[PDB]
């Protein structure tokens, strides 16, 4: 039952600041240190800093010095991190990890991790997606196999979820990872391959959910001639 | 992140580019897991005692749940650094992509934009090339690609290439084509259509 529980996803504008919490459980918080590490989209890990659960003393990475502050609350077994003067490149998943019993020769490692906290930094405003059908036709049919789908376009922030026929259709489904456009809005397609003989009698509907904008869309995808 | 194509049961040795502290494993969408540390913890198939020159991680025999990315942790004057990861993917027989093309829907054409979707479905290896031609003219800088993670059932990848133009530019042209090259194809595959047809 040894675990670290972090606060929920955040969306911030450039120049603003962000605060993330890390709650310890099933162990003595005061006898270990806490490290903070971030991971930018499709990139490696970057160490941000360390704080003692005992002393409250800190060691920050040179790059973030003066911009980051780490604190602790020994009464509630919680560690906190604040990042100021936010910029687009600060968009990442932020992790806290238990780091060393409170002689670096016997380094124990970062043995317990939080679930991570997504922080998006952007000048864009919240926007629900535009859902367009990707109709099955002769151009998306070869043999007894037809491809069809939905284009889930121009939304902010991540994430969206896509299901087919209320979750009754799962085989052959591919929902692509979102790409970030120059407009600052995201876009993706969700596709499925089905027998081409089923097109006249079977109904295909994509269920799109975007909680940040409170958008739900159920789009019927109908066959098209040439 | 660097990539290694391996089979279940293979022995794998990963070198860390003494300053070594630990080895970690990270699965997609998940937080890292500690494997081995300087406390000399970790018997198991994961070991750090390869040799006394460089610091390595040996996986004695890859198991079905070992396909993830591995990275080392190092130090330099109490400032940690994480080496860049090695992603281990599962190797399988070559499979050519099934190619499909979707013209823009008339619903999108109402809204002043036109996106043309080219789908490359269930292929292996991951390396595939897609090029767009509009009225026989090669395009660059107006399309975007997305690739799925390796499929947990058939070990293949799928890719979308989306060409985006303004409706005004889209209507000034007739023929739309995507040309695909891949290891599993002896000759390139071209999927195309005429606007309005």
Count the Cβ atoms, other than its own, within 10 Å of residue A160.
24
Task: Tell me whether residues A108 and B144 touch, CB distance under 8 A.
Answer: no
Give CA–CA dist A205/A224, Å, rounded.
Answer: 15
- Cα distance between the two ends of chain A: 59
At B94, list the tokens: 């070559």
Closest CA relative to residue B155, chosen from B32, B1, B27, B7: B7
Judge if A113 and A176 occupy the same domain: no
B105 at interface of A, judged by CB pairs closer than 8 A: yes
Chain A residues inside the 8 Å CB shell of B79: 47, 61-62
Is the distance from CB of B17 to CB of B2 less than 8 angstroms? Answer: no
3-class DSSP string for chain A: CCEEEECCCEEECCCCCEEEEEEEECCCHHHEEEEEEEECCCCCEEEEEEEECCCCCEEECHHHCCCEEEEEECCCCEEEEEECCCCHHHCEEEEEEEEEECCCCCCCCEEEECCCEEEEECCCCCECCEEEEECCCHHHEECCEEEEEEEEEEEECCCCEEEEHHHCECCCEEECCCEECCCCCEEEEEEEEEEHHHCCCCCCEEEEEEHHHCEEEEEECCCCCC
A166 lies in the same domain as A187: yes
C-alpha distances in angstroms, A175 versus A150, B89, B117, B121?
Answer: 9, 20, 14, 12
Coil, strand, or helix at residue A200?
Answer: coil
Q: Is the domain of A108 the same as that of A152?
A: no
Residue to substitute from A94, A159, A176, interface B, most B β-carbons within 10 A = A176
Residue among A89, A107, A85 at smallest CA distance from A98 = A107
Q: Where is the domain boundary, A75, A94, A123?
A: A123
Pick the last residue of a domain from A70, A94, A123: A123
Distance from A71 to chain B by nearest Cα, in Å? 19
Tell which of A6, A44, A117 to mutate to test the B interface (max B CBs under 10 Å): A44
Q: What are the chain B neighbours of A35 within 8 Å (beta carbons)?
A: 80
Of A91, A123, A155, which one is at a domain's C-terminal end?
A123
Secondary structure (DSSP) of A111-162: EEE---EEEEE-SPPPBPPEEEEE---GGGEETTEEEEEEEEEEEBSS--EE
Do residues A84 and A33 both lie within one domain? Answer: yes
Min Cα distance B90 → chain A (Å) is 19
Same domain, A88 and A6: yes
Cβ pairs A/B, distance under 8 A = 132
Q: A81 - beta bridge partners?
A: A20, A70
- Calpha distance A79→A58 (Å, rounded): 12
What domains lie within chain B, and their CATH numbers?
1-92 (2.60.40.10), 94-195 (2.60.40.10)
Neighbour tally for A30: CB within 10 Å: 14
Question: Measured between alpha carbons, how far is A147 from A152 in angstroms, rounded to an integer?
Answer: 16
**Taking CB atoms and an 8 Å cutoff, what residues of chain A touch B145?**
179
- How far apart, in whole angstroms, are the C-alpha atoms of residue A15 and residue B53? 47
User: Residues of B143-157 as b/e, b for ≥16 C-beta within 10 angstroms?
Assistant: beebebebeeeebbb
Same domain, residue pair A107 and A50: yes
Helix (H) or strand (E) holding B18: none
- Go through B15-30 and write b for each residue having 16 or more CB atoms within 10 A of its CB, e for each that does not: ebeeebbbbbbbeeee
Q: Under a CB-based contact definition with an 8 Å cutoff, are residues B33 and B86 in contact? A: no
A136 and A86 co-located in one domain: no
Q: How far is CA B122 from the centre of its chain?
A: 13
Q: Does A91 share its domain with A157? A: no
Domain co-membership, A118 together with A166: no
Range of the domain at A117: 1-123
Tokens 């009698």, residue located: A201
* Same structural domain, A98 and A65: yes
Cα–Cα distance for residue pair A31/A196, rounded to 1 Å? 63
Identify the three-state secondary structure at position A166: helix
**Structural domains counted in chain A:** 2
Q: Rounded CA gap, A214 and A216, in Å?
A: 7
Q: Are residues A109 and A159 in the same domain?
A: no
Residues A195 and A94 grouped into a single domain: no
Point out the residue among A147, A174, A181 whose CB comes nearest to the CB of B148.
Answer: A174
> Which residues in chain B touch residue A181, judged by CB atoms under 8 angstroms apart?
144
Number of H helices, E strands in chain A: 0, 20
Q: Determination technique for this PDB entry?
A: X-ray
Is the previous residue joined to A130 through a cis bond, with omega within 30 degrees of 0?
no
Give yes or no for a contact between A225 and B197, defined as CB atoms under 8 angstroms apart.
no
To test the contact with chain A by mutation, choose from B2, B31, B106 the residue with the greatest count of A C-beta atoms within 10 A, namely B31
Residues 169-198 of A with CB under 8 A from B: 174, 176-179, 181, 187-189, 191, 193
Contact B162 A130 (CB under 8 A): no
Domain with residue A185: its CATH number is: 2.60.40.10
Looking up tokens 């990275």, which residue turns up? B71
Q: Which residues pair with B85 in a beta bridge?
A: none
CB contact under 8 A, B22 and A177: no
Our CA-based measurement puts residue A207 at a distance from the nearest CA of chain B, in whole angstroms, of 18
Question: Which of these, B22, B149, B99, B164, lies nearest to A110 by C-alpha position?
Answer: B22
B39–A107 C-beta distance less than 8 A: yes
Residue A140 phi, psi dihedral angles, 5° rounding: -125, 35
Q: Which of A105, A108, A188 shows the shortest C-beta gap to B146?
A: A188
């Amino acid at each position: 039952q040894v675990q670290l529980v972090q606060s929920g996803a955040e969306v911030k504008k450039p120049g603003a600041s962000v605060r993330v919490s890390c709650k310890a459980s099933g162990y003595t918080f005061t006898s270990y240190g806490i490290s903070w590490v971030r991971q930018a989209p499709g990139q490696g890990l970057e160490w941000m800093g360390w704080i003692s659960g005992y002393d409250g003393n800190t060691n920050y990475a040179q790059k973030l010095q003066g911009r980051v502050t780490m604190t602790t609350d020994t009464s509630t077994s919680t560690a906190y991190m604040e990042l100021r003067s936010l910029r687009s490149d600060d968009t990442a998943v932020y992790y806290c990890a238990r780091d060393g019993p409170q002689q670096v020769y016997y380094y124990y490692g970062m043995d317990v991790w939080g679930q991570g906290t997504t922080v998006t930094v952007s000048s864009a405003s919240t926007k629900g997606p535009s859902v367009f059908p990707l109709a099955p036709s002769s151009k998306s049919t070869s043999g007894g196999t037809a491809a069809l789908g939905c284009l889930v376009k121009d939304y902010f922030p991540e994430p969206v979820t896509v299901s087919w026929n209320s979750g009754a259709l799962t085989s052959g489904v591919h929902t692509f990872p979102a790409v970030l456009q120059s407009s600052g809005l995201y876009s993706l397609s969700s596709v499925v391959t089905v027998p081409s003989s089923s097109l006249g009698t079977q109904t295909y509907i994509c269920n799109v959910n975007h909680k940040p904008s409170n958008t739900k869309v159920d789009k019927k995808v109908e066959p098209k001639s040439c | 992140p660097s990539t290694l194509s391996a089979s279940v049961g293979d022995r794998v040795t990963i070198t860390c580019r003494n300053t070594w502290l630990a080895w970690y494993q990270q699965k997609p969408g998940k937080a890292p897991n500690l494997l081995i540390s300087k406390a000399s913890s970790l018997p198991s198939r994961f070991s750090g005692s390869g040799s006394g020159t460089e610091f390595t991680l040996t996986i004695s025999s890859l198991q079905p749940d070992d396909f993830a990315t591995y990275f080392c942790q190092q130090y330099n004057s109490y400032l940690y650094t994480f080496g860049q990861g090695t992603k281990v993917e599962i190797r399988r027989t070559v499979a050519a992509p099934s190619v499909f093309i979707f013209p823009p829907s008339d619903e999108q054409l109402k809204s002043g934009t036109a996106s043309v979707v080219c789908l490359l479905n269930n292929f292996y290896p991951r390396e595939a090339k897609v090029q767009w031609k509009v009225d026989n003219a090669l395009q660059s800088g107006n399309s975007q690609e997305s690739v799925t993670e390796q499929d947990s059932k058939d070990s293949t990848y799928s890719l979308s290439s989306t060409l985006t133009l303004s409706k005004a530019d889209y209507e000034k042209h007739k023929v739309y084509a995507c040309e695909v090259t891949h290891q599993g194809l002896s000759s390139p595959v071209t999927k195309s259509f005429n606007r309005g047809e």
